Design a protein around this ligand. Structure first.
Ligand code: NA
Lengths: 311, 311, 311, 311, 311
C-alpha cells in the first residue's frame, strides 16, 4: 500500500470529525481527562474509484489492511488509544469515508488561578506526518464534529466542543506536519466547595475572634490555637485536591491570608495578657476593643482586594 | 465478509440478551460499576443455510472471523470489553446463535440527594450502527435477559435487572443507530453509616451541649471547640467517600447545619462569660437556661424539616 | 473442530484439577484474592485414539488449536485469566491430559461478623456450558487437586484446599451447565490487632476513667474529650480496612459500645461539677465513687455479653 | 516442534543465568519487588547441528517459532512476564544460545522482626516441567548470572545476587520438575527512620514527663495526654508502611512498650493530684521525686532488654 | 532477515534521535517520569540500495517485517514500549530512515538533598546488543534530538534535553554493547511550598514563642504542645511526598532542627514554673527574658548554618 498520487501536486486534504460519546475522569492534579469518542476521516483516493453503472453497487466497503489509510495520531495522549474500526466506505469517485471508535486519557494543562470558580479549555490535538511522495493537510468537517446530549463530566459543566478549523502546519525533522485543535470548554461546579470548605473555614475563623470578648488568656490560647490547627487541616485537605502551581490560586490566597489573621490574633491575645499582668488592663482593654472592629473590617477589605485582583 | 442481504425491504433485527454473572466494584466518586456478564446475539443470515442430510450435523459451529457478525458496541464503558466468544451456532434456516462472555467498567451517573438512604438505576447501553447495504435494529429477547442468584454488589441491594424493550432508533452522522437500555436497580445498605458516622456525630454534638450546665468558660471553650474539630473530621471523612455534587445531599445538609449549632453554641458560651465578668450572672443564667431547651428543640425540628424536604 | 461424539447417550465427563502455586493479595474491602495455579483437564475423545504397537509412541502431544478442548470458564473472576497452555497429551484410548497455568483475581465474599477473629471459605468456581451435540458434566480428580507447601497468604493461615466433588448441574438459557466448587479455607492472623488497635484503644478508655479520681472539672473535660477524639481516630482507622457491611462486626460492636462509655463519662463529669457548684459535693462524691466501680464492672460484663453473642 | 531426543537416557540440562538490568518498586505491604533482567538459556539440540565448513557460517540465527525452546517459567510472579526475545544462536554441534529480556513483579516474603534495621533475601524461582518424551533438568551457568553496577533499589542496599546451583528436582501431578533459586540479598536504609520517626517520638515522650516537675494537674494532663496522642499518630504512621505480621517487630515492640509508660505516667499524675487534694502533698512529693529517676531508668533498661532480645 | 554485511571490518553505526512530544507524571517517591516521544534511527544497509535513474523514484518505503532493523532497546524503563512505527524510508545508496512513536515510564534516580529547591538530570538510555556477524555502535544525530515548545512537566521547569554524543561501549555476557545517554535537565517549582508548608510551619513556631511573654504555665503548655502537634502534621505531610533517602534533605534538616526548638521551649516553660513555685520568680524572669532574644537569634543563626551547608 502507497499514498494516493496527486492529480496535480496539491497535497491530500484529510477531513476530520470528532464526536464525543462519553466524557469522564478529569484529574486536576495530573491535568488529564478521559474521553470516549468517534473519529471520522475522509480523503480522495482515485485508485479506488469505480463506475456505479457497471459495478452495480453505489458504495464499496473495505477492511483497514486492504486500502491506504493516513496515519492520523493524537499528540497529547497518555494511553494507547483503544482504536476499533467501525466503517470504511468508498464512493464512485474514490472518496473514502472512515470511522473509528476510540478512547484516550488526554493531557491538557489547567489554570487554577480562579479555583474553584475556574473555567478550562481542554484540547484534543490531531496530527498527520506528510509522506515522501506527497504532503498531507488536515481539515475540519464541522458536520461530523460534536458531542452527545447525555455527555456529562462529573463536577463540571460542559459548555462547548469546537474545532480550530485552520490547521497549524509546521516543519518537524525535515517533514511537513498538519496539527488540528479540538477545544472542549468546561466550567467548574463550585457548589460543594461553599458548605464543605469555604463556610466551615469561615466559621472556625469567626470562632477564633471570640477571644476579643474574653479576658481569660488560658481560654484565648485554646480558642486561637485550636481553630488554627483546624485551619491547618483545611489548608492540607485543599492542597491535596490540587497540583503544585508556580502561581497563587484564589482559594490559596484566602487560605494563606487567614494564617496571618491567626498570627496577629495570637499577638493581640499575648499583648492583652502581658498588659493585664503589667497591672495596666486599661491599655489591654483599648487594644482588645479596637481588634473587635479592626479584624472583621481588615478581613472584609482584604477579601474585596483579593476578589478584585483575581476576577 | 458482508452483511446478510434483505429478501424484503426490512432491516436486520439483532436479538440481544444479557445475563449478569458477577456484579462488583461500584465507585461512588467515579459513578462507575464493574460487571461480568453473558451477551447473547441472534440474527438471520440466509447465506449460512445448510442441509443436515448432506452436512451430516443438525447445527453448525463457527469461528468469529469465519462469518459476518453485527458490530454491537457498549455506549457507557471505560475499559475495552474483555470479549471472549463462548459459542456461535447456525441452524439450517440460517439463524445465528451468538454468545460471548464480557466484563466492563460501566459509566452510569448516580443521584446522591438522599445519600446514604439513596437508590440508583444503573444503565448498560447496547448500540449498533447501520451499514451501507441495510439498516440494523436491536431487539430484546427477554428469555435470555437476567442475573444469577449469587450476584451480589457489596454494600448494595440488587432489586431488578430489566431491559427497555423498545430500542431508541435515531440518526447520527447520516446513519441509523439502534440503542438499547438495560437497567439495574439498586438500593444502598445504609446500616454501617448509623454506628460509624451518624450516631458518633450525634454523641459529639450532645457532648458539646453539656456546656449549658457548666459555668467554667475555660472548660466550655474546650468542650465546644474540641467536639467541633471532631465534627470537622467526620465532614472530611464523609466528603472523601462522595463526588463533588452541584446539589446538597441529605448527609451534607445535616453535617452543614450542625456547623451552625457549634457556631451558635460558641456565641452562647462567650455571652455567658462576658455577662459573668460584667457582674450580671443573672442574665447569663437565663440565657444558659434557655439554650438547654432551645438547642435540642431547634435541632429536633430542623432535622424534621430537612427529612421532610429530602424524602 | 467439533466435540467427541458419544458412544451412547451419556454426557462427556471432564476431570478437573486445580492446584495453587502462589496465593496472594487478599483485599477485605473488595472481597477479592489473587491466585497463581495449575488447571488440569481430562476427557475421552475417541477420534484421537491410536494403536500403541503400530504408532510406536505410547503418548502423542498436540497444540491447543489442533484438537477439540472443552470451554471451561471461571465464574467469580475479575480480570481475564492469564492462560498459558503447558501440556496436551493423548493416550492410546483417546484420553486427553490437558494442563494450563493460570492466574486470576477471584471474587469470593467475606463474613466479617467475628473480625479480626474471623475465618473465611474462599471459592473458585469452574463451569462448562454444554454444546448442541452433547452435554458436558464436570468431575473432580482429587489426585490433581492441592496446593504447594510454600503457598502463603500474608496475614492469614491457609487451612485447606478441597473440592465439592458433586458438581451443581443446572439449566441456563435453555442449556445444561455443570458448576464445580473449589474451597480454600483461611483463618485470620489477629496477633497484630491486639498491640496496634485493641490494647491502645483500651488504654485511652482507662485513661478516660481517671476523671473518677479527679475533682478538677477543667482537667476532666480535657481528659474525657481528648480520649474521645483518640477513639474517634481508631473507629476511623478500623472502618478504612473494612467494607460497609449490612451487619454489626465484633470490633464494630465493641468500638460503638465504647462511644456510650465516653458519653456517660461526660455526663458523670458534668454532674460532679454541677453538684460541686450547687454546694452539694456530698452527692457528687457518692456518684464519682459509684462510677469508680460501675464503669469497669459494666464494661467487663458488656464485653462478656458481646463475646458470648458473637462466638 | 518436539524436544531433542536423548543420545541415551540422560535428561536435557538447560543452562540458565539471570542478569538484573534494573531493580525497583519493593512493596513491604505486598511483599513484592519488580525486576528488569536478562534471562539466558542454553541446551543441546543435535537436530539443529551443522558442518561449519560447507555451511560457510560458524553460527546460525533462528526465530522462536522455528525451533524447539524449553518452557521455562517463573514460580513467584504476579503479572505475566514481559518476554522479548533478543537472540537465538545455534553453534555447529547444536548448542542453542537463547537470550530474552524480561520484567516481572516478584512475590518474595519479607521478615520484619528487626524492622527498620532488617535485612532480606529476595527470591526468583525458575522452573521447567519435564515432557512426555524426556525429563528436563535446570543448571546454573554462573558466567551469565549477575547484576549491573547502576542497579539500585530505592531505600535499600543491594548486597548480593547469587544462584543456588543445585536445582530442587521433585514430582508434581505425575511429572518431574526442576526448580532453581536466584537469591537477591538486600539490607534496609534505616537512616530516614531516625530523624523522622524514632527521634521525634522520643521527644513527645520526654515532653510527656516534664509533668514530673509540675504540680499543676491540668498541665500534666495536657503534657502526658497531649503528648500521648501525638504517639497515636506516630503509631498509625508506622503500621501503614507495614503488613499485618503474626509476630512482634522491633519498632512495634518499642512503640507498644511506650503505651505503657504513657499509661503509668497518667496513673502517677492522677496519684500526685489525689494525694495533693487529700492534704498529703508529702507522699505526692516522694512519688514524683522517684518517677523522675524511675521512668528514665526503667525506659533505658527496657530498651536494652528489647534490643538484646531482637538482635 | 540478517544484518547488513560490512564492506570492511567496520561496525554498523546506528544514528539515533529522540524528540520529546509530551513530558509528564514525574513521581518523586518512585523516581520515575513518563514520556511521549519520537525515536529516529538511521543505518547503511547496502543490500537495500537502488539506482534512482531506472527505479524512477528517489525513496522506497518498507514495512518493519520486510527489512532488517537493529534491536534498539531502553535500559531504564518500567512500561513496555508503546512502539508504533510511523515511517521507514530507503535512499538510493541504502540509508534507512526509521521513525517510531513511543511512550515509557522511565526510571531515573533523583537527588533530594536541596529539596524543594533541587534540580535534577533525568536520563533515557538507548542500548544495542551487537550480533554474531558484526558489532553495532550507536551515534547521535543532534538534528533529530530535541523537544516541542508546548512540552511541560507539571511543577517543574524544563531546562535542556541533550545527548551524550560519545556512546559508552562495553562488554556484557561475551558481547559488545553500545549505550547512549539522553539527559533531560529540570529544576523544581518551589513557589507553592512557601505559602503551603514553609511559612505556616514558621507561624506555628513563632506562635509557640509567645510563651516567653507569658507566666501562665497552664497556657504555655497549651501553646508549645499544640504548635508541636502542628509541626508533627507538617513533618508527616512532607515525608509522604518524598522517598526514604539515606541522607538528610534541606527541608528535612530544618523540620528536625525545629523539633529541638520545641523541646528546649518545653524545658524553658517547665523551668519558669518550677522556679515560680520554688518562690524564686527572680531567676524565672531572667531565664524567660534571655529566651526572648536567644530562641530567635539561635534559630536565625542555625538556619544560616544549614543553608550554608546545603547550598
Ligand atoms: Na486544656
Amino acid at each position: 500500500v502507497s499514498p494516493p498520487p496527486p492529480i496535480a501536486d496539491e497535497p491530500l486534504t484529510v477531513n476530520t470529525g470528532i464526536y464525543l460519546i462519553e466524557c469522564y475522569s478529569l484529574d486536576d492534579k495530573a491535568e488529564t481527562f478521559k474521553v470516549n469518542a468517534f473519529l471520522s476521516l475522509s480523503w480522495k483516493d482515485r485508485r479506488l474509484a469505480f463506475d456505479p453503472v457497471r459495478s452495480g453497487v453505489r458504495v464499496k466497503t473495505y477492511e483497514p489492511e486492504a486500502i491506504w489509510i493516513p496515519e492520523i495520531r493524537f499528540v497529547n495522549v497518555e494511553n494507547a488509544r483503544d482504536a476499533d474500526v467501525v466503517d470504511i466506505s468508498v464512493s464512485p469517485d474514490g472518496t473514502v469515508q472512515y470511522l473509528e471508535r476510540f478512547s484516550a486519557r488526554v493531557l491538557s494543562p489547567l489554570d487554577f488561578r480562579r479555583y474553584p470558580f475556574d473555567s478550562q479549555t481542554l484540547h484534543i490535538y490531531l496530527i498527520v506526518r506528510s509522506v515522501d511522495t506527497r504532503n498531507i493537510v488536515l481539515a475540519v468537517d464541522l458536520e461530523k464534529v460534536g458531542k452527545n446530549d447525555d455527555v456529562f463530566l462529573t463536577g463540571w459543566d460542559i459548555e462547548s466542543f469546537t474545532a480550530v478549523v485552520k490547521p497549524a502546519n509546521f516543519a518537524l525533522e525535515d517533514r511537513l506536519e498538519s496539527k488540528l485543535d479540538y477545544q472542549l470548554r468546561i466550567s467548574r461546579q463550585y457548589f460543594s466547595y461553599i458548605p464543605n470548605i469555604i463556610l466551615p473555614m469561615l466559621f472556625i475563623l469567626f470562632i477564633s475572634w471570640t477571644a476579643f470578648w474574653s479576658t481569660s488568656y488560658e481560654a484565648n490560647v485554646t480558642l486561637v490555637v485550636s481553630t488554627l490547627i483546624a485551619h491547618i487541616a483545611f489548608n492540607i485537605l485543599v492542597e491535596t485536591n490540587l497540583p503544585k502551581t508556580p502561581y497563587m490560586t484564589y482559594t490559596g490566597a484566602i487560605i494563606f491570608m487567614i494564617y496571618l489573621f491567626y498570627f496577629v490574633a495570637v499577638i493581640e491575645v499575648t499583648v492583652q495578657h502581658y498588659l493585664k499582668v503589667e497591672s495596666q488592663p486599661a491599655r489591654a482593654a483599648s487594644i482588645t476593643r479596637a481588634s473587635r472592629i479592626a479584624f472583621p473590617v481588615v478581613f472584609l477589605l482584604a477579601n474585596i482586594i483579593l476578589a478584585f485582583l483575581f476576577f
